[PDB]
């Protein structure tokens, strides 16, 4: 059974490239081989690349064009649909500079003045019918006619891919193929549209420590990351070095989040990643677009060690937790 050349292979970090159609359409042997490859990727790197996913490239291109049209809106129109609370986790955001005030501790004043916020903006969409948390959609005029219908369609197709990736994980683990279905079928996911504005490379010298997206781990089960061809995404290697996650045409980068790491009793890795300058020399870095679809267990789900991820009970590292509660704690922490 032919395995593809790794998407990334540097400094001990090996991120496999996997043809997802072989899990969905292959005979039983090929299906299992592919599922095991997916699982092995999550167990080692915490990251995989998938090609030939059910989401069509022309639709993805349209979704990116539609996203670009949103971010071209004037600042006042974007702020009108602003991110409000961590428990909603929906709407427009752009990181601002912290201000010095009467209340600030003088030890922190030097840091605040020299701090460089991430050069990015985002717009987050949740499932439409979540009680108490409506999506703040912008008005549908001119270029934004079709915005909602496009993004809701994309949301549901990514929701479907989440279910299938978890099925691959289950098949790879040798547990019931549909084990995760009842934990993920609600689609309590977040569609994060990202725009990193064009920026002069000198900005990164004027502001040392400046990045496009600060280093972090994702919170949920998995993240489906669709990136354009600009580059800048980096994944931390097992030797502690950030390695370039090179863009590959018509792939989706998939990584496990902290909840899946915990759920798997740390058999699956949630790996630190960031976005920095693209690895090419140029005076001006053009705009970068990406879409992060954060997949989560159902907010009602109780998360405890998956069967087959431990032998003796003493090997369980974590107490059970409610999924929804965990996420809001992560979202609310910074504020
Ligand atoms: O833009 C990217 O490629 C990464 C975005 C990301 O890691 C995130 O939004 O959590
Ligand atoms: C990084 C991150 C931000 N917002 C979310 O909802 N989930 C995540 O994993
Ligand atoms: Ni991330």
UniProtKB/TrEMBL annotation:
<keyword id="KW-0408">Iron</keyword>
<feature type="binding site">
    <location>
        <position position="196"/>
    </location>
    <ligand>
        <name>2-oxoglutarate</name>
    </ligand>
</feature>
<feature type="binding site">
    <location>
        <position position="192"/>
    </location>
    <ligand>
        <name>2-oxoglutarate</name>
    </ligand>
</feature>
<comment type="similarity">
    <text>Belongs to the iron/ascorbate-dependent oxidoreductase family.</text>
</comment>
<dbReference type="Pfam" id="PF03171">
    <property type="entry name" value="2OG-FeII_Oxy"/>
</dbReference>
<dbReference type="InterPro" id="IPR026992">
    <property type="entry name" value="DIOX_N"/>
</dbReference>
<keyword id="KW-0106">Calcium</keyword>
<dbReference type="InterPro" id="IPR050231">
    <property type="entry name" value="Iron_ascorbate_oxido_reductase"/>
</dbReference>
<feature type="binding site">
    <location>
        <position position="218"/>
    </location>
    <ligand>
        <name>Ca(2+)</name>
    </ligand>
</feature>
<feature type="domain" description="Fe2OG dioxygenase">
    <location>
        <begin position="187"/>
        <end position="297"/>
    </location>
</feature>
<keyword id="KW-0560">Oxidoreductase</keyword>
<feature type="binding site">
    <location>
        <position position="273"/>
    </location>
    <ligand>
        <name>Ca(2+)</name>
    </ligand>
</feature>
<dbReference type="InterPro" id="IPR044861">
    <property type="entry name" value="IPNS-like_FE2OG_OXY"/>
</dbReference>
<dbReference type="InterPro" id="IPR005123">
    <property type="entry name" value="Oxoglu/Fe-dep_dioxygenase_dom"/>
</dbReference>
<dbReference type="Pfam" id="PF14226">
    <property type="entry name" value="DIOX_N"/>
</dbReference>
<dbReference type="GO" id="GO:0051213">
    <property type="term" value="F:dioxygenase activity"/>
</dbReference>
<dbReference type="InterPro" id="IPR027443">
    <property type="entry name" value="IPNS-like_sf"/>
</dbReference>
<keyword id="KW-0479">Metal-binding</keyword>
<keyword id="KW-0223">Dioxygenase</keyword>
<feature type="binding site">
    <location>
        <position position="288"/>
    </location>
    <ligand>
        <name>2-oxoglutarate</name>
    </ligand>
</feature>
<dbReference type="GO" id="GO:0046872">
    <property type="term" value="F:metal ion binding"/>
</dbReference>
<dbReference type="GO" id="GO:0044283">
    <property type="term" value="P:small molecule biosynthetic process"/>
</dbReference>
<feature type="binding site">
    <location>
        <position position="290"/>
    </location>
    <ligand>
        <name>2-oxoglutarate</name>
    </ligand>
</feature>
<feature type="binding site">
    <location>
        <position position="216"/>
    </location>
    <ligand>
        <name>Ca(2+)</name>
    </ligand>
</feature>
<protein>
    <submittedName>
        <fullName>Thymine dioxygenase</fullName>
    </submittedName>
</protein>
């Amino acid at each position: 059974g032919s395995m593809e050349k790794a998407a990334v292979n540097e400094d001990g970090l090996v991120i496999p490239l996997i043809d997802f159609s072989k899990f969905l359409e292959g005979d039983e042997t090929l299906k299992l081989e592919t599922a095991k490859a997916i699982l092995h990727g999550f167990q080692t790197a915490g990251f995989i690349y998938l090609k030939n996913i059910p989401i069509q490239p022309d639709f993805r291109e349209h979704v990116f064009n539609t996203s670009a049209k949103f971010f071209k809106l004037p600042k006042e129109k974007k702020l009108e649909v602003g991110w409000t609370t961590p428990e909603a986790n929906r709407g427009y955001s752009a990181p601002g500079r912290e201000k010095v005030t009467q209340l600030t501790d003088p030890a922190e004043i030097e840091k605040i003045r020299s701090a460089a916020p991430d050069i990015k903006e985002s717009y987050e969409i949740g499932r439409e019918d979540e009680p108490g948390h409506p999506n703040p959609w912008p008005a549908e005029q001119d270029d934004l006619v079709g915005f909602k219908s496009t993004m809701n369609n994309f949301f549901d197709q990514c929701k479907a891919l989440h279910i299938e990736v978890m099925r691959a994980i289950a098949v790879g683990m040798g547990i019931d193929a549909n084990y995760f279905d009842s934990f993920v079928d609600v689609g309590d996911n977040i569609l994060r549209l990202l725009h990193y504005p064009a920026v002069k490379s000198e900005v990164f010298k004027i502001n040392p420590g400046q990045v496009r997206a600060g280093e972090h781990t994702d919170y949920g089960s998995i993240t489906l990351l669709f990136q354009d061809s600009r580059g800048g995404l980096q994944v931390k290697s097992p030797n502690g070095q950030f390695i370039d996650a090179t863009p590959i045409e018509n792939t989706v980068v998939v990584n496990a989040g902290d909840l899946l790491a915990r759920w798997s009793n740390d058999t699956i890795k949630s790996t630190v990643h960031r976005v920095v300058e693209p690895p090419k020399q140029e005076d001006v870095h053009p705009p970068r677009y990406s879409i992060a679809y954060f997949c989560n267990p159902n907010h009602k789900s109780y998360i405890e060690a998956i069967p087959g991820t431990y032998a003796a009970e003493s090997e369980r590292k974590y107490e059970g937790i409610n999924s929804g509660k965990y996420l809001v704690q992560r979202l609310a922490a910074t504020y």
